[PDB]
């Protein structure tokens, strides 16, 4: 009868963050084919550059999920809890050029983004429960989802105070 | 006139990742400059815990955007390009209990999720362009958006090969 | 001709902190001397507990009102003035239980609050003047009096920055 | 289903203790850390004194709420419950002088007042519940609120028998 | 009856130094929100640069205002005097470019200016008295106020001898 | 043809800061080269003090105007730009006494104020443009010019937040 209550603040409003699909067919094994860490290459990239878009994924598990959480008493630590984490890092390499002037040089613009999710898990932790924390981390940066980029832009401007 | 090509593989289909808003009112500034990392406390949590949900936002910028990327020739480095980086880390503290049994203990379960993004930004780089990199990082894990959690389940199960 | 000016910042607005009366009839002397320190016990409490609500009062006075205030020069120390001080400490023990479930255990929740007022009194120091310092000590915690409890809630939550 | 009962004696009558607001705008951090203890200085005071009015705030919390309350048995100690505590200390320095006689010397009159609230909080402990203990601590000293100052005057006069 | 005589040379002539207002609405907290040192950012600046106009203000007070003034005898040092100082530093970043030729590069020109005012203050020191020393420091550089820039220009030319 | 944009927030309103001239005749060259700092003595002061009012002027120039500014890319550094800097420090020595009382002591009160300005100067930078930076540094402190002293009073009172 145990239930999991997120101890958060959640609103009534909802927004659509619109993801465009990324096909698996163009991706190729690079390192760690069988192992807990894998790195893929997107071969839908410019043949002739030295850099090409990669995305890696790796998973980690720990037996002691409360190791870094000392402000929690043992009397409240679930002794059946196990720590599951995963980590993705996508690097892509954009190309700026204009077809108008071929004299003008082509530049390579690197971009990288990484997400690390580390949950404690017991028998009542669900897939959607864990998905919720990613969506709540995203929510304050994209408060209208794909609609406007206002908070994102102010993060690019160097204005870290998002809630004030 | 220069255009930016995301050297990358995209698809035709699109999914909705449905974000639920997080109201800004309950968050309280706790620590940090703009020069340091800003930290907020979600005060809409169980007061009777000594751990409470926090999300933090840090962002930093550099005039040397190619410092980490080694295999990009100078002839391809945009001299006007700048490095813009931001980093968020949300820690929430879930609570498991059941109203069926006043005699059975309650446990607090820690969860953390962190997103870092470093874009090379030039004149033609738009806020939408930069949101694209986060959206493409997310898309392989949530290929149907909020619809299903199959690939996320794999990542938690310890299977890192999203693409196979 | 002498007037006393509080050297403070005060506003135009006012608010009602609404007190509910504490009947004297039930309290009983438990310890101390009727000269210096007295501890009353609220007999309006449960018989069956070893703890019962008690409020203590304690007065002292000194001919050396500037003893700890070293940074006031003698040219500005009023030689007629004299130090008066009182201290109250209320301890109440709350009782939590649900009448729906008599199997569910009852708990005792201790709560305690103390006020210490030390004034330097001179000929022109009045009752109302000395009340003013208690009122101005409270006003930061109760900016709207009984109207809301927001700043008090912040104090309990552990957020000491009340003036920002 | 659990309810919290104050184990106290309360009356039917109510009175307004009327607070005048303390503007936050003039206060300035002078010492401490923004985490535990902070001391603000009222810049709305005289430049020419080495002493200026200052109000300090200080919060602490503990996982052992029954540490000093030895006379409560473990069968009645709520294991979920946790100790929260705050402390405020306002020091203001009054200025006595008559404008009629500028030959007559001006004096500095120090006044100081401190409030310490330590509650054991549990899931059902509310903001208003914790405010109640401060209000019931005040009510013996201010039986009519701002209406008269008689009991406060007795305290200053040195007469600690407030309930008779 | 004490009066403050500036021990200076002052003329009969006066000039208008014409200040154009700087609105507070565009300015944003950066560091030290509550503390004695604050740094603001002018967000009416170019979004896309790495540098943006800031102005900081910080205040300092000292108990020993005669510390660095040894040529003054104790018999003439006001023992009630207190040292108050403040310091502002404004950095702005100009942009030179012509809309005629977009080939031509845009340059960023940094400019910085700082004012430090450190007064001894007694009960008879007035706001306008302290304002006077800033106006007298400015007076020889801008002897016709906003009218002509002759002495300013000769300071930019490296000709320090202003009175000869 | 290149134009200079002060990347900055300005307002429509203008105030007069009323400067009173300082006659050059009473000042006497005391120390310093053009290579050193020039120092003048205001000989229109009380001879019977061993301290007398002095104002000094130093100015220095460098071919490397971006040395202190780190986050400006070379692609945005004007190769023709030069750094012009000047620095003035006025010390006056006030005198407090009263003609009402020959028996009461006189005191001398030191005051100092210093302005430093370092502009990046290029072909298009005019003397007026450079005066602008001093005028905009002054304007937040004197938002109504010589009219009122409210913000200056705050700075002296120890409240650094001019903009809030």
mmCIF file with all atom_site columns, C-alpha atoms in Angstrom, chain B:
data_model
loop_
_atom_site.group_PDB
_atom_site.id
_atom_site.type_symbol
_atom_site.label_atom_id
_atom_site.label_alt_id
_atom_site.label_comp_id
_atom_site.label_asym_id
_atom_site.label_entity_id
_atom_site.label_seq_id
_atom_site.pdbx_PDB_ins_code
_atom_site.Cartn_x
_atom_site.Cartn_y
_atom_site.Cartn_z
_atom_site.occupancy
_atom_site.B_iso_or_equiv
_atom_site.pdbx_formal_charge
_atom_site.auth_seq_id
_atom_site.auth_comp_id
_atom_site.auth_asym_id
_atom_site.auth_atom_id
_atom_site.pdbx_PDB_model_num
ATOM 1   C CA . UNK B 1 1   ? 24.276 35.785 -46.085 1.00 0.00 ? 1   UNK B CA 1
ATOM 2   C CA . UNK B 1 2   ? 25.465 33.146 -43.623 1.00 0.00 ? 2   UNK B CA 1
ATOM 3   C CA . UNK B 1 3   ? 23.180 30.256 -42.644 1.00 0.00 ? 3   UNK B CA 1
ATOM 4   C CA . UNK B 1 4   ? 23.674 27.678 -39.891 1.00 0.00 ? 4   UNK B CA 1
ATOM 5   C CA . UNK B 1 5   ? 23.421 23.981 -40.800 1.00 0.00 ? 5   UNK B CA 1
ATOM 6   C CA . UNK B 1 6   ? 22.940 21.619 -37.878 1.00 0.00 ? 6   UNK B CA 1
ATOM 7   C CA . UNK B 1 7   ? 25.240 18.913 -39.186 1.00 0.00 ? 7   UNK B CA 1
ATOM 8   C CA . UNK B 1 8   ? 23.010 16.157 -37.894 1.00 0.00 ? 8   UNK B CA 1
ATOM 9   C CA . UNK B 1 9   ? 20.298 13.594 -38.661 1.00 0.00 ? 9   UNK B CA 1
ATOM 10  C CA . UNK B 1 10  ? 16.687 14.711 -38.054 1.00 0.00 ? 10  UNK B CA 1
ATOM 11  C CA . UNK B 1 11  ? 13.394 12.987 -38.781 1.00 0.00 ? 11  UNK B CA 1
ATOM 12  C CA . UNK B 1 12  ? 9.960  13.983 -40.061 1.00 0.00 ? 12  UNK B CA 1
ATOM 13  C CA . UNK B 1 13  ? 7.905  12.866 -37.046 1.00 0.00 ? 13  UNK B CA 1
ATOM 14  C CA . UNK B 1 14  ? 7.363  14.972 -33.914 1.00 0.00 ? 14  UNK B CA 1
ATOM 15  C CA . UNK B 1 15  ? 6.277  14.051 -30.390 1.00 0.00 ? 15  UNK B CA 1
ATOM 16  C CA . UNK B 1 16  ? 4.981  16.093 -27.459 1.00 0.00 ? 16  UNK B CA 1
ATOM 17  C CA . UNK B 1 17  ? 6.981  15.934 -24.227 1.00 0.00 ? 17  UNK B CA 1
ATOM 18  C CA . UNK B 1 18  ? 4.331  17.269 -21.862 1.00 0.00 ? 18  UNK B CA 1
ATOM 19  C CA . UNK B 1 19  ? 5.843  19.484 -19.172 1.00 0.00 ? 19  UNK B CA 1
ATOM 20  C CA . UNK B 1 20  ? 3.873  20.454 -16.098 1.00 0.00 ? 20  UNK B CA 1
ATOM 21  C CA . UNK B 1 21  ? 4.660  23.961 -14.905 1.00 0.00 ? 21  UNK B CA 1
ATOM 22  C CA . UNK B 1 22  ? 6.541  24.657 -11.697 1.00 0.00 ? 22  UNK B CA 1
ATOM 23  C CA . UNK B 1 23  ? 5.196  27.810 -9.994  1.00 0.00 ? 23  UNK B CA 1
ATOM 24  C CA . UNK B 1 24  ? 7.832  30.397 -9.218  1.00 0.00 ? 24  UNK B CA 1
ATOM 25  C CA . UNK B 1 25  ? 6.120  31.764 -6.104  1.00 0.00 ? 25  UNK B CA 1
ATOM 26  C CA . UNK B 1 26  ? 7.128  28.949 -3.689  1.00 0.00 ? 26  UNK B CA 1
ATOM 27  C CA . UNK B 1 27  ? 10.856 29.158 -4.590  1.00 0.00 ? 27  UNK B CA 1
ATOM 28  C CA . UNK B 1 28  ? 13.127 31.143 -2.255  1.00 0.00 ? 28  UNK B CA 1
ATOM 29  C CA . UNK B 1 29  ? 16.596 32.428 -3.134  1.00 0.00 ? 29  UNK B CA 1
ATOM 30  C CA . UNK B 1 30  ? 19.032 30.766 -0.729  1.00 0.00 ? 30  UNK B CA 1
ATOM 31  C CA . UNK B 1 31  ? 22.619 31.176 -1.950  1.00 0.00 ? 31  UNK B CA 1
ATOM 32  C CA . UNK B 1 32  ? 24.764 32.556 -4.711  1.00 0.00 ? 32  UNK B CA 1
ATOM 33  C CA . UNK B 1 33  ? 25.725 35.530 -6.893  1.00 0.00 ? 33  UNK B CA 1
ATOM 34  C CA . UNK B 1 34  ? 25.309 35.822 -10.601 1.00 0.00 ? 34  UNK B CA 1
ATOM 35  C CA . UNK B 1 35  ? 29.071 35.167 -10.397 1.00 0.00 ? 35  UNK B CA 1
ATOM 36  C CA . UNK B 1 36  ? 28.356 32.099 -8.240  1.00 0.00 ? 36  UNK B CA 1
ATOM 37  C CA . UNK B 1 37  ? 25.621 29.456 -8.647  1.00 0.00 ? 37  UNK B CA 1
ATOM 38  C CA . UNK B 1 38  ? 22.075 30.603 -7.770  1.00 0.00 ? 38  UNK B CA 1
ATOM 39  C CA . UNK B 1 39  ? 20.189 28.209 -5.481  1.00 0.00 ? 39  UNK B CA 1
ATOM 40  C CA . UNK B 1 40  ? 16.452 28.065 -4.771  1.00 0.00 ? 40  UNK B CA 1
ATOM 41  C CA . UNK B 1 41  ? 14.499 26.178 -2.116  1.00 0.00 ? 41  UNK B CA 1
ATOM 42  C CA . UNK B 1 42  ? 11.032 24.821 -2.955  1.00 0.00 ? 42  UNK B CA 1
ATOM 43  C CA . UNK B 1 43  ? 9.157  25.864 0.207   1.00 0.00 ? 43  UNK B CA 1
ATOM 44  C CA . UNK B 1 44  ? 6.090  23.910 -0.858  1.00 0.00 ? 44  UNK B CA 1
ATOM 45  C CA . UNK B 1 45  ? 7.546  20.777 0.733   1.00 0.00 ? 45  UNK B CA 1
ATOM 46  C CA . UNK B 1 46  ? 7.170  18.839 3.953   1.00 0.00 ? 46  UNK B CA 1
ATOM 47  C CA . UNK B 1 47  ? 8.601  21.165 6.580   1.00 0.00 ? 47  UNK B CA 1
ATOM 48  C CA . UNK B 1 48  ? 9.045  18.175 8.922   1.00 0.00 ? 48  UNK B CA 1
ATOM 49  C CA . UNK B 1 49  ? 12.006 16.947 6.851   1.00 0.00 ? 49  UNK B CA 1
ATOM 50  C CA . UNK B 1 50  ? 15.453 18.448 7.248   1.00 0.00 ? 50  UNK B CA 1
ATOM 51  C CA . UNK B 1 51  ? 15.980 17.902 3.505   1.00 0.00 ? 51  UNK B CA 1
ATOM 52  C CA . UNK B 1 52  ? 13.893 19.929 1.092   1.00 0.00 ? 52  UNK B CA 1
ATOM 53  C CA . UNK B 1 53  ? 13.755 20.233 -2.705  1.00 0.00 ? 53  UNK B CA 1
ATOM 54  C CA . UNK B 1 54  ? 16.196 22.658 -4.300  1.00 0.00 ? 54  UNK B CA 1
ATOM 55  C CA . UNK B 1 55  ? 16.964 23.672 -7.852  1.00 0.00 ? 55  UNK B CA 1
ATOM 56  C CA . UNK B 1 56  ? 20.089 25.610 -8.799  1.00 0.00 ? 56  UNK B CA 1
ATOM 57  C CA . UNK B 1 57  ? 21.114 27.585 -11.879 1.00 0.00 ? 57  UNK B CA 1
ATOM 58  C CA . UNK B 1 58  ? 24.663 28.513 -12.910 1.00 0.00 ? 58  UNK B CA 1
ATOM 59  C CA . UNK B 1 59  ? 25.799 30.090 -16.151 1.00 0.00 ? 59  UNK B CA 1
ATOM 60  C CA . UNK B 1 60  ? 29.210 31.128 -17.493 1.00 0.00 ? 60  UNK B CA 1
ATOM 61  C CA . UNK B 1 61  ? 30.570 32.530 -20.738 1.00 0.00 ? 61  UNK B CA 1
ATOM 62  C CA . UNK B 1 62  ? 33.941 32.639 -22.480 1.00 0.00 ? 62  UNK B CA 1
ATOM 63  C CA . UNK B 1 63  ? 35.540 34.368 -25.448 1.00 0.00 ? 63  UNK B CA 1
ATOM 64  C CA . UNK B 1 64  ? 37.468 31.170 -26.302 1.00 0.00 ? 64  UNK B CA 1
ATOM 65  C CA . UNK B 1 65  ? 34.767 28.777 -27.513 1.00 0.00 ? 65  UNK B CA 1
ATOM 66  C CA . UNK B 1 66  ? 37.112 26.233 -29.121 1.00 0.00 ? 66  UNK B CA 1
ATOM 67  C CA . UNK B 1 67  ? 39.139 25.557 -25.961 1.00 0.00 ? 67  UNK B CA 1
ATOM 68  C CA . UNK B 1 68  ? 37.703 22.083 -25.336 1.00 0.00 ? 68  UNK B CA 1
ATOM 69  C CA . UNK B 1 69  ? 37.443 20.999 -28.977 1.00 0.00 ? 69  UNK B CA 1
ATOM 70  C CA . UNK B 1 70  ? 40.804 19.943 -30.351 1.00 0.00 ? 70  UNK B CA 1
ATOM 71  C CA . UNK B 1 71  ? 40.238 18.729 -33.915 1.00 0.00 ? 71  UNK B CA 1
ATOM 72  C CA . UNK B 1 72  ? 38.724 21.924 -35.370 1.00 0.00 ? 72  UNK B CA 1
ATOM 73  C CA . UNK B 1 73  ? 41.244 23.821 -37.551 1.00 0.00 ? 73  UNK B CA 1
ATOM 74  C CA . UNK B 1 74  ? 41.765 27.538 -37.039 1.00 0.00 ? 74  UNK B CA 1
ATOM 75  C CA . UNK B 1 75  ? 40.694 28.115 -40.653 1.00 0.00 ? 75  UNK B CA 1
ATOM 76  C CA . UNK B 1 76  ? 37.260 26.845 -39.529 1.00 0.00 ? 76  UNK B CA 1
ATOM 77  C CA . UNK B 1 77  ? 37.043 28.721 -36.196 1.00 0.00 ? 77  UNK B CA 1
ATOM 78  C CA . UNK B 1 78  ? 34.628 31.686 -36.267 1.00 0.00 ? 78  UNK B CA 1
ATOM 79  C CA . UNK B 1 79  ? 36.531 34.611 -34.676 1.00 0.00 ? 79  UNK B CA 1
ATOM 80  C CA . UNK B 1 80  ? 33.246 36.225 -33.633 1.00 0.00 ? 80  UNK B CA 1
ATOM 81  C CA . UNK B 1 81  ? 31.978 33.068 -31.953 1.00 0.00 ? 81  UNK B CA 1
ATOM 82  C CA . UNK B 1 82  ? 31.504 33.006 -28.182 1.00 0.00 ? 82  UNK B CA 1
ATOM 83  C CA . UNK B 1 83  ? 30.844 30.201 -25.689 1.00 0.00 ? 83  UNK B CA 1
ATOM 84  C CA . UNK B 1 84  ? 27.619 30.423 -23.667 1.00 0.00 ? 84  UNK B CA 1
ATOM 85  C CA . UNK B 1 85  ? 27.057 27.763 -21.003 1.00 0.00 ? 85  UNK B CA 1
ATOM 86  C CA . UNK B 1 86  ? 24.365 27.100 -18.402 1.00 0.00 ? 86  UNK B CA 1
ATOM 87  C CA . UNK B 1 87  ? 23.793 24.362 -15.857 1.00 0.00 ? 87  UNK B CA 1
ATOM 88  C CA . UNK B 1 88  ? 20.789 23.429 -13.757 1.00 0.00 ? 88  UNK B CA 1
ATOM 89  C CA . UNK B 1 89  ? 20.582 20.806 -10.999 1.00 0.00 ? 89  UNK B CA 1
ATOM 90  C CA . UNK B 1 90  ? 17.274 19.871 -9.386  1.00 0.00 ? 90  UNK B CA 1
ATOM 91  C CA . UNK B 1 91  ? 17.238 17.684 -6.295  1.00 0.00 ? 91  UNK B CA 1
ATOM 92  C CA . UNK B 1 92  ? 13.887 16.515 -5.006  1.00 0.00 ? 92  UNK B CA 1
ATOM 93  C CA . UNK B 1 93  ? 13.239 14.314 -1.982  1.00 0.00 ? 93  UNK B CA 1
ATOM 94  C CA . UNK B 1 94  ? 10.334 11.897 -2.389  1.00 0.00 ? 94  UNK B CA 1
ATOM 95  C CA . UNK B 1 95  ? 8.463  10.360 0.541   1.00 0.00 ? 95  UNK B CA 1
ATOM 96  C CA . UNK B 1 96  ? 7.118  6.793  0.619   1.00 0.00 ? 96  UNK B CA 1
ATOM 97  C CA . UNK B 1 97  ? 4.417  5.817  3.134   1.00 0.00 ? 97  UNK B CA 1
ATOM 98  C CA . UNK B 1 98  ? 0.952  4.302  3.282   1.00 0.00 ? 98  UNK B CA 1
ATOM 99  C CA . UNK B 1 99  ? -2.162 5.653  4.984   1.00 0.00 ? 99  UNK B CA 1
ATOM 100 C CA . UNK B 1 100 ? -3.274 2.027  5.392   1.00 0.00 ? 100 UNK B CA 1
ATOM 101 C CA . UNK B 1 101 ? -0.736 1.361  8.160   1.00 0.00 ? 101 UNK B CA 1
ATOM 102 C CA . UNK B 1 102 ? 0.093  3.985  10.785  1.00 0.00 ? 102 UNK B CA 1
ATOM 103 C CA . UNK B 1 103 ? 2.514  1.404  12.234  1.00 0.00 ? 103 UNK B CA 1
ATOM 104 C CA . UNK B 1 104 ? 4.723  1.096  9.125   1.00 0.00 ? 104 UNK B CA 1
ATOM 105 C CA . UNK B 1 105 ? 7.743  3.395  8.733   1.00 0.00 ? 105 UNK B CA 1
ATOM 106 C CA . UNK B 1 106 ? 8.076  6.257  6.281   1.00 0.00 ? 106 UNK B CA 1
ATOM 107 C CA . UNK B 1 107 ? 11.128 6.661  4.067   1.00 0.00 ? 107 UNK B CA 1
ATOM 108 C CA . UNK B 1 108 ? 12.575 9.620  2.176   1.00 0.00 ? 108 UNK B CA 1
ATOM 109 C CA . UNK B 1 109 ? 13.982 8.826  -1.293  1.00 0.00 ? 109 UNK B CA 1
ATOM 110 C CA . UNK B 1 110 ? 16.481 11.218 -2.939  1.00 0.00 ? 110 UNK B CA 1
ATOM 111 C CA . UNK B 1 111 ? 16.369 12.038 -6.644  1.00 0.00 ? 111 UNK B CA 1
ATOM 112 C CA . UNK B 1 112 ? 18.622 14.360 -8.646  1.00 0.00 ? 112 UNK B CA 1
ATOM 113 C CA . UNK B 1 113 ? 18.772 15.494 -12.271 1.00 0.00 ? 113 UNK B CA 1
ATOM 114 C CA . UNK B 1 114 ? 21.203 17.906 -13.907 1.00 0.00 ? 114 UNK B CA 1
ATOM 115 C CA . UNK B 1 115 ? 21.350 19.454 -17.389 1.00 0.00 ? 115 UNK B CA 1
ATOM 116 C CA . UNK B 1 116 ? 24.409 21.274 -18.760 1.00 0.00 ? 116 UNK B CA 1
ATOM 117 C CA . UNK B 1 117 ? 24.453 23.087 -22.114 1.00 0.00 ? 117 UNK B CA 1
ATOM 118 C CA . UNK B 1 118 ? 27.378 24.842 -23.792 1.00 0.00 ? 118 UNK B CA 1
ATOM 119 C CA . UNK B 1 119 ? 26.655 26.358 -27.203 1.00 0.00 ? 119 UNK B CA 1
ATOM 120 C CA . UNK B 1 120 ? 28.945 28.192 -29.559 1.00 0.00 ? 120 UNK B CA 1
ATOM 121 C CA . UNK B 1 121 ? 26.947 31.355 -30.327 1.00 0.00 ? 121 UNK B CA 1
ATOM 122 C CA . UNK B 1 122 ? 27.543 33.663 -33.293 1.00 0.00 ? 122 UNK B CA 1
ATOM 123 C CA . UNK B 1 123 ? 25.506 36.441 -34.916 1.00 0.00 ? 123 UNK B CA 1
ATOM 124 C CA . UNK B 1 124 ? 23.222 33.993 -36.732 1.00 0.00 ? 124 UNK B CA 1
ATOM 125 C CA . UNK B 1 125 ? 22.670 31.641 -33.770 1.00 0.00 ? 125 UNK B CA 1
ATOM 126 C CA . UNK B 1 126 ? 19.097 32.098 -32.503 1.00 0.00 ? 126 UNK B CA 1
ATOM 127 C CA . UNK B 1 127 ? 17.540 31.150 -29.184 1.00 0.00 ? 127 UNK B CA 1
ATOM 128 C CA . UNK B 1 128 ? 15.482 28.559 -31.055 1.00 0.00 ? 128 UNK B CA 1
ATOM 129 C CA . UNK B 1 129 ? 18.673 27.144 -32.597 1.00 0.00 ? 129 UNK B CA 1
ATOM 130 C CA . UNK B 1 130 ? 20.114 26.697 -29.114 1.00 0.00 ? 130 UNK B CA 1
ATOM 131 C CA . UNK B 1 131 ? 16.927 25.122 -27.772 1.00 0.00 ? 131 UNK B CA 1
ATOM 132 C CA . UNK B 1 132 ? 17.271 22.651 -30.624 1.00 0.00 ? 132 UNK B CA 1
ATOM 133 C CA . UNK B 1 133 ? 20.338 21.069 -29.061 1.00 0.00 ? 133 UNK B CA 1
ATOM 134 C CA . UNK B 1 134 ? 18.512 20.318 -25.807 1.00 0.00 ? 134 UNK B CA 1
ATOM 135 C CA . UNK B 1 135 ? 15.522 18.996 -27.755 1.00 0.00 ? 135 UNK B CA 1
ATOM 136 C CA . UNK B 1 136 ? 17.738 16.679 -29.815 1.00 0.00 ? 136 UNK B CA 1
ATOM 137 C CA . UNK B 1 137 ? 19.570 15.495 -26.708 1.00 0.00 ? 137 UNK B CA 1
ATOM 138 C CA . UNK B 1 138 ? 16.214 14.588 -25.135 1.00 0.00 ? 138 UNK B CA 1
ATOM 139 C CA . UNK B 1 139 ? 14.598 13.040 -28.208 1.00 0.00 ? 139 UNK B CA 1
ATOM 140 C CA . UNK B 1 140 ? 16.433 9.644  -28.277 1.00 0.00 ? 140 UNK B CA 1
ATOM 141 C CA . UNK B 1 141 ? 15.411 8.939  -24.654 1.00 0.00 ? 141 UNK B CA 1
ATOM 142 C CA . UNK B 1 142 ? 11.797 10.111 -25.178 1.00 0.00 ? 142 UNK B CA 1
ATOM 143 C CA . UNK B 1 143 ? 11.161 9.104  -28.807 1.00 0.00 ? 143 UNK B CA 1
ATOM 144 C CA . UNK B 1 144 ? 7.385  9.355  -28.273 1.00 0.00 ? 144 UNK B CA 1
ATOM 145 C CA . UNK B 1 145 ? 7.448  12.217 -25.803 1.00 0.00 ? 145 UNK B CA 1
ATOM 146 C CA . UNK B 1 146 ? 5.285  11.804 -22.744 1.00 0.00 ? 146 UNK B CA 1
ATOM 147 C CA . UNK B 1 147 ? 3.542  8.941  -24.568 1.00 0.00 ? 147 UNK B CA 1
ATOM 148 C CA . UNK B 1 148 ? 5.665  5.975  -23.471 1.00 0.00 ? 148 UNK B CA 1
ATOM 149 C CA . UNK B 1 149 ? 8.671  5.470  -21.227 1.00 0.00 ? 149 UNK B CA 1
ATOM 150 C CA . UNK B 1 150 ? 10.274 2.487  -22.931 1.00 0.00 ? 150 UNK B CA 1
ATOM 151 C CA . UNK B 1 151 ? 13.744 3.866  -23.641 1.00 0.00 ? 151 UNK B CA 1
ATOM 152 C CA . UNK B 1 152 ? 13.851 5.643  -20.287 1.00 0.00 ? 152 UNK B CA 1
ATOM 153 C CA . UNK B 1 153 ? 12.977 2.333  -18.637 1.00 0.00 ? 153 UNK B CA 1
ATOM 154 C CA . UNK B 1 154 ? 15.921 0.761  -20.461 1.00 0.00 ? 154 UNK B CA 1
ATOM 155 C CA . UNK B 1 155 ? 18.296 3.475  -19.266 1.00 0.00 ? 155 UNK B CA 1
ATOM 156 C CA . UNK B 1 156 ? 17.186 2.835  -15.690 1.00 0.00 ? 156 UNK B CA 1
ATOM 157 C CA . UNK B 1 157 ? 17.347 -0.958 -16.184 1.00 0.00 ? 157 UNK B CA 1
ATOM 158 C CA . UNK B 1 158 ? 21.014 -0.440 -17.042 1.00 0.00 ? 158 UNK B CA 1
ATOM 159 C CA . UNK B 1 159 ? 20.899 -0.860 -20.847 1.00 0.00 ? 159 UNK B CA 1
ATOM 160 C CA . UNK B 1 160 ? 22.727 2.094  -22.445 1.00 0.00 ? 160 UNK B CA 1
ATOM 161 C CA . UNK B 1 161 ? 22.207 1.347  -26.149 1.00 0.00 ? 161 UNK B CA 1
ATOM 162 C CA . UNK B 1 162 ? 19.322 3.653  -27.059 1.00 0.00 ? 162 UNK B CA 1
ATOM 163 C CA . UNK B 1 163 ? 20.097 3.278  -30.760 1.00 0.00 ? 163 UNK B CA 1
ATOM 164 C CA . UNK B 1 164 ? 20.909 -0.452 -30.661 1.00 0.00 ? 164 UNK B CA 1
#
